[PDB]
């Protein structure tokens, strides 16, 4: 349990750390190398000192709830300023200049025939 | 010396093959055959001409082969070995021909046709 | 002490006859010539929509093939140089001389 989130017990530590929101493969490897820990050692077969070092490294990465709050604040700011990206966020359409005549499902939800 | 030189071709692979009196070792581009080729089936095919001529292990092979992929270069080597055995002894012509090893496989990659995805494959058709 | 002659032409016939002419001129002048050496031909292919409008699937493919010939003169002489520089070749072939 790191950053207030449990992680799979039987998964290798490097992969299992990615389950923390804000932690991916690259940052997981970087954290594991900073806090010296075997790459292939499973979290279940892990030492308390290693877990503490991992927590110490992780706490400063600005992940999980703080990261979610920051992303939401950015989205809200662009919505509030009345930017084009804000309008498209409000309308639930692609924001990065895609074509909406077709293929905009991940932003527009399921097809309404 | 006593070198028996020959050429082999397959697809876009050309193999200059020299046979010398030896113990059966095959060197390809200064590398062992069993390391150069990624499968033992290719080695067996290479040795097939020797089996046909009944001179297995009586020659060491030196190969300078370039072009194509691994199977193409292997079969070019086989063609070159058959040609070299022909040069060494004309009496092997019948056995090699019956084995079908003197033939230079003429199959090549067909060009792409304009208006087609490939040489033959055509775009998916849709009435209406 | 060598002179290179590079000939480029769209017609292999004209390039070959020009190469023979220059080789004969050099041999007459007295120099020794190694060649002609046919360098690989450079072929540029152009694919065009045959129709003026629509009809994508029908095409026409043209080519321009430039053939390349190399001549080496080994023992140059003032007579050889004068003959080479005074010799006139057909308008098709392009000749470059590197001394």
């Amino acid at each position: 349990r790191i950053a207030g989130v449990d992680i799979p017990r039987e998964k290798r530590v490097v992969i299992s750390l990615t389950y923390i929101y804000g932690i991916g493969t690259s940052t997981a490897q970087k954290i594991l190398e900073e806090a010296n820990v075997s790459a292939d050692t499973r979290v279940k077969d892990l030492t308390d000192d290693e877990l503490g070092r991992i927590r110490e490294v992780v706490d400063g990465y600005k992940v999980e709830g703080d990261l979610r709050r920051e992303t939401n604040l950015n989205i809200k700011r662009l919505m509030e300023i009345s930017s084009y990206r804000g309008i498209r966020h409000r309308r639930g359409l692609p924001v990065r200049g895609q074509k909406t005549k077709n293929n905009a499902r991940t932003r527009k939800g399921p097809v309404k025939t | 010396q006593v070198e028996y030189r020959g050429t082999g071709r397959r697809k876009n692979s050309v193999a200059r093959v020299r046979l010398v009196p030896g113990e059966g070792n095959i060197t390809v581009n200064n590398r062992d055959v069993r390391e150069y080729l990624p499968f033992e089936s290719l080695i067996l095919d290479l040795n097939q001409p020797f089996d046909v001529t009944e001179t297995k292990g009586n020659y060491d092979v030196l190969v300078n082969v370039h072009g194509g992929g691994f199977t193409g270069q292997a079969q070019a080597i086989r063609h070159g070995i058959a040609r070299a055995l022909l040069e060494a002894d004309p009496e092997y012509r019948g056995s090699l021909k019956r084995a079908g090893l003197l033939t230079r496989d003429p199959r090549m990659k067909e060009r792409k046709k304009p208006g087609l995805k490939a040489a033959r494959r055509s775009p998916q058709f849709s009435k209406r | 002490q060598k002179i290179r002659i590079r000939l480029k032409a769209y017609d292999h016939r004209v390039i070959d006859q020009s190469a023979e002419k220059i080789v004969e001129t050099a041999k007459r002048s007295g120099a020794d010539v190694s060649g002609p050496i046919p360098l690989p031909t450079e072929k540029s292919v152009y694919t065009i929509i045959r129709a003026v409008h629509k009809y994508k699937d029908s095409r026409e493919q043209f080519e321009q093939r430039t053939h390349k010939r190399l001549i080496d003169i080994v023992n140059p002489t003032p007579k050889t140089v004068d003959a080479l520089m005074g010799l006139n070749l057909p308008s098709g072939v392009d000749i470059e001389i590197k001394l």
């Binding site: - | - | 769209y10 308008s91 072939v93 392009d94």
Partner: protein, 204 residues
């Protein structure tokens, strides 16, 4: 639907009309040649200019005008040829040398026949009689085969159609055959009439 026979045979048994080489200023030389050809065509309309070959070397432009009326192009004292040369030198900074080639049998030249029939059509002759007489004289002059075609609003009719006549052999699919092909246009009061002529003077 039918390949242009000249285009099919160029580079096989027919030589290019532009005899030169370039690597860098290819486009500039090509469009220089095109403007030269356009100028010659506009200037020698009355002359029976069958065709023109252009070569260039040593900063010189060798023009070869194959024509059926060499006297008209040259002039009695060479004045016409000299004037053409001067105009070409004015158009192009390079120096132009012009040669004139005589065509003995204008009636066996596809382009000359096409232009003659187009001129008659503009004069409002019969699109059938013109082709018939063309094929007759070409065939009597030893042509192994000839084909003529005229398409458009033939007699001014609203519905455009095409009609053609032939005689002898014109093997358009034989790549050996040296078939002379030409297309011309009559600008009749009703519009464009397209004339096509194929001539096969035999093996050579």
């Amino acid at each position: 639907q039918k390949i242009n026979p000249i285009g099919l045979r160029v580079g096989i048994i027919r030589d290019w009309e532009a005899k030169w080489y370039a690597e860098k200023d290819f486009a500039s030389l090509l469009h220089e040649d095109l403007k030269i050809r356009k100028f010659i065509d506009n200037e020698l309309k009355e002359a029976s200019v069958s065709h023109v070959e252009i070569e260039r070397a040593a900063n010189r432009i060798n023009i070869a005008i194959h024509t059926g009326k060499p006297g008209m192009v040259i002039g009695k004292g060479g004045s016409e040829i000299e004037k053409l040369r001067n105009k070409l030198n004015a158009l192009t900074d390079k120096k132009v040398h012009i040669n004139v080639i005589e065509i003995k049998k204008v009636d066996l030249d596809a382009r000359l026949v096409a232009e003659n029939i187009a001129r008659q059509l503009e004069n409002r002759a019969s699109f059938r009689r013109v082709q018939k007489q063309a094929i007759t004289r070409a065939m009597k002059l030893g042509a192994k085969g000839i084909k003529t075609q005229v398409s458009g609003r033939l007699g001014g009719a609203d519905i455009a159609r095409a009609e053609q006549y032939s005689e002898g052999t014109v093997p358009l699919h034989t790549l050996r055959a040296d078939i002379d092909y030409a297309h011309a246009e009559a600008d009749t009061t009703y519009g464009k009439l397209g004339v096509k002529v194929w001539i096969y003077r035999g093996e050579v």
